[PDB]
Design a protein around this ligand. Sequence first.
Ligand SMILES: [Cu+2]
Ligand SMILES: [Cu+2]
Ligand SMILES: [Cu+2]
Ligand SMILES: [Cu+2]
Ligand SMILES: [Cu+2]
Lengths: 77, 382, 153, 229, 238, 118
Amino acid sequence: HGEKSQAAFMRMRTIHWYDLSWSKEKVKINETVEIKGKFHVFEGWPETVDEPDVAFLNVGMPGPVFIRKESYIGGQL
Amino acid sequence: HGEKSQAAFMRMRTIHWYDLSWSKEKVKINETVEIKGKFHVFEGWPETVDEPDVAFLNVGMPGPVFIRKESYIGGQLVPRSVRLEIGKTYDFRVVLKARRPGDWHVHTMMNVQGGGPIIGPGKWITVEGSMSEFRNPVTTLTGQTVDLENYNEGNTYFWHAFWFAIGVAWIGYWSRRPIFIPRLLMVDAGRADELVSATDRKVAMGFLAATILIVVMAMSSANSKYPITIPLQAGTMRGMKPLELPAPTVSVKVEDATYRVPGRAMRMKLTITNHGNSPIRLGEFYTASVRFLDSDVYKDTTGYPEDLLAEDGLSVSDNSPLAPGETRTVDVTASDAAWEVYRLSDIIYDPDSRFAGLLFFFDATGNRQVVQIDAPLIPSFM
Amino acid sequence: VPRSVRLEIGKTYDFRVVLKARRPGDWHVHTMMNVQGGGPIIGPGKWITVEGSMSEFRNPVTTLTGQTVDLENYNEGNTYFWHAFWFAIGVAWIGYWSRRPIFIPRLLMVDAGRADELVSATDRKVAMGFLAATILIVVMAMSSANSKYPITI
Amino acid sequence: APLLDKKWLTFALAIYTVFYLWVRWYEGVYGWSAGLDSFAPEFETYWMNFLYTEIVLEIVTASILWGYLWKTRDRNLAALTPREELRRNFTHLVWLVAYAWAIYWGASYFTEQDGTWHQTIVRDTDFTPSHIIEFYLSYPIYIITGFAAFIYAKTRLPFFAKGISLPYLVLVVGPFMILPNVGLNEWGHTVAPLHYGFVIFGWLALAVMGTLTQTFYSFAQGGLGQSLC
Amino acid sequence: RSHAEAVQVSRTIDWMALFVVFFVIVGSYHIHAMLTMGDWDFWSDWKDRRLWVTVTPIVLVTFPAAVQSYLWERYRLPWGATVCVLGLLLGEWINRYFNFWGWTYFPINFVFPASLVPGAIILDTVLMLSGSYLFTAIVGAMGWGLIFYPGNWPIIAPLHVPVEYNGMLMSIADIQGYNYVRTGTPEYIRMVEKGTLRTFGKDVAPVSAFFSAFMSILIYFMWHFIGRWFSNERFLQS
Amino acid sequence: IILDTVLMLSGSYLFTAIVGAMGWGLIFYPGNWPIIAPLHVPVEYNGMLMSIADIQGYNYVRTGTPEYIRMVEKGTLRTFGKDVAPVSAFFSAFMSILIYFMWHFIGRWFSNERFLQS
Ligand SMILES: [Cu+2]
Ligand SMILES: [Cu+2]
Ligand SMILES: [Cu+2]
Ligand SMILES: [Cu+2]
Ligand SMILES: [Cu+2]
């Protein structure tokens, strides 16, 4: 809910998410869902966006409707 | 026309233009000249110049005496800025079209965000004909063919003249009545109401309404006449292809770099080691736009500028064929008047007295290897 | 490396520092790397004992002009001479006006409207002479310094 | 004798226009032929000689004009016939016209002619033909005209001789400080801040709004006022 | 001294004073505008939707505000902003036809300046009709900032036509700037819209304009007080 | 002494703020050159070209100030070789004409004599 209004070139030439997999589509109030996958930082990065030298793996949700128990990039938390 | 006054260390240690070739030296008012070649962004880039992260392949000419039809860095068209990498050789090709008749000094140049201009060698090109014969046609995606020299010249004149006439009429309406001095006298006298009448208010309201209506109607008409428009395209291209040059089989170590400064000459001592399987001879030394040649080893056929070409400038004490696997130390002297003319001696005035350059080694069969020299430069006064 | 340097995050480099001893005592010497955005990075330190007298220290260098100079006493007479000369000129300029009555009756006469009687033509002539002499001395000193040291970088 | 002396206004307009047109023609013909290379002998022959001669001539003309204007100061100003005061006010307004025209030619035409030169050459030398004509020719010309107008106002008009007019002093001083700015222009080169000094001191020209007002009041002091009812 | 001919003396003085005001305004306004926003006016490569409409109207309230204050307060002359706009346009056009095209031979349709008259008459009418400097400083400044881009669009629209140049999508203004080589200004100096991850596609041209309008409401007001300072008449004694 | 003489002879704070400040900015480097010239002698130290002042700073180790803190001339692609020393001086002169003037008014504020009652 916020990507339909971003520059359709930024969206194309920033990161290339793929091989994604969501464990479940119906959890309960104390259950966990795992979102695995891989991303490719494009080589022709836009120039009005600074390089991913300070990035953060966030989750896009309508407020704390879920809590990030753990987030790993490469095996490390 | 602007390189003779740049720091002779910046000029030496920024970019190393080579293998350049200018197609013609006499074009006509609608003909094209191609400036091909290769550049090597030096690894020891100056530190008061930002890295070539935002660069641009420009052409150095006295105003639009030629138009850049196309400019390519690596095979791809670069109509925008570019990101280059400190240490790589790239290939470049500029196709220009001639506008004005005369003898012009055209130079390739690289503009860098943090340092400014880096000017390469320049060549004299003669253009014959008449400027009125120049035409620049393009074909738009909408299906219209337009000449860029006279396109949108009537519209701009029309609208600017219309707005200027409106402003002049607005001023002249009030200029028909008495102006500054009795107006000031009546204002100071407390008669601030008698100067403005209801007719003036009505005229002002009409002017404001007409201005707003005219602007809106003109915008609507322009939108209708040109329904398909795109925003202004600006960006920096990151993925430029560098040249994958084989690793040189020659190694040169500089032991002493000395230049006299009542002088036109430069001296270095080089320890040269050959790792290739062919005998090798040093044929050329490249410094900041100046090529010092040796007539025995290598001759020039590309047509380099006369003022920058030293046919016999390079003198090597022991320029015998260097056997494979052998190391030897030689004294190399590069002497030409271009050292004085192009103010490479003013390195005496520079805060960083280090020099960089390219050596070219030619084997017996004709193969050529490029080696880089980077060393401090020492003046000799006695 | 008599200047700054660019290092790469992740590489091993080799370093060698040759120092010459000046002062006698037991000193804690450490190698260190100074970085533009972080400041000092101090390595291990070692205790070194220096024996002798400080007056025996000599630092000779040989310039490209052909002169051999000791850096500890080089250009010590010239700096003292010029700074003392300029200080003496300034002191004389102040003392010229300090020979006459100073702040308080001057303020009383200024408040009384007598702003012209305080400055005479002799003071104007002295000031003009001082200005002309200062400019001439500066120009002549610069010319003499250029002649004495024609080769500078 | 007519109240306004037409020949002097015509002379001022004509001399300024003719001299600046000749300078533009010289630039158009020789700047392309010799002014492109700053190390060529033709550059010294046609442009540096121009700079030296122009500097000496400007100093001589400024000194002579200021000296002649000061040496003819009206020693007694109470014995002036009001008609003579009106004539002197007209002459001062002609001086203001000349100063305005010089300001136009200096800060509006050649300053942008020089913007034109920079998007056609690579570097900003201290003595490009545009700088020779703009920094050292036109700016001193309008500075000389402004200072001469101020001196004329002080030593020949009864209203302006009663003190130093703050708007007039600002109008003749600020526009001048743009000249000293050059140093920062060069120090910066060696829409950008390196140029915000010309902006600041260009504003002080707006001080004309004050000065002109004083001028009008002088015209009203004689008798024009009551007659204009 | 006069005899019912004062009328003539007035008329004459008026003409000379009009000349002086007009040309001093020309010089000062032109040097200021060129020295602040000159690079956007110089080239059609810089007439974009983000920074052109942001910078140009914000910078150009400075002299109209002061001249409007002086000419309204003392003479009830409402042409304060229009004369500044006309003088700036005249200076830019004279230099462009005689130096950009006459000297360096850049084409006219490539170096044309921006149009400012409709907003100037808007501001002058707003000040005259309401007679309030605060109502003007708000409403007229906002309108001045808003009307800038619609006023220039009829001149700019034919240059923004899509084209495929050597395989890459460009506009006609971009091709003009690319073909006609300016050795002084590379492409990267262009302070034009480049797009961001927070920029909304079709909302750049309006929003920026509105920003300009708001800033005008500030700058005008400030410069109004500056216009009340240069309009002094004090005689310092030293 | 240049500034003081300029103020006394003309008796004008504006003429001083222009001419004397410009002269003050211009005379700074010629005044120091006789002291500085012998330190700017070329030398070849361990194969690299240096000045005597540079060797002094390199030899005499200051743990607090590394070399990179030195706000010294380093050269640019827009810098003209022999025109750095004069132009910079002129820049200084111009800025003096500003700062002096401003501080003059500050000098007129600290010279007050008011007695606040709280
Ligand atoms: Cu969503
Ligand atoms: Cu990818
Ligand atoms: Cu050239
Ligand atoms: Cu290289
Ligand atoms: Cu310039």
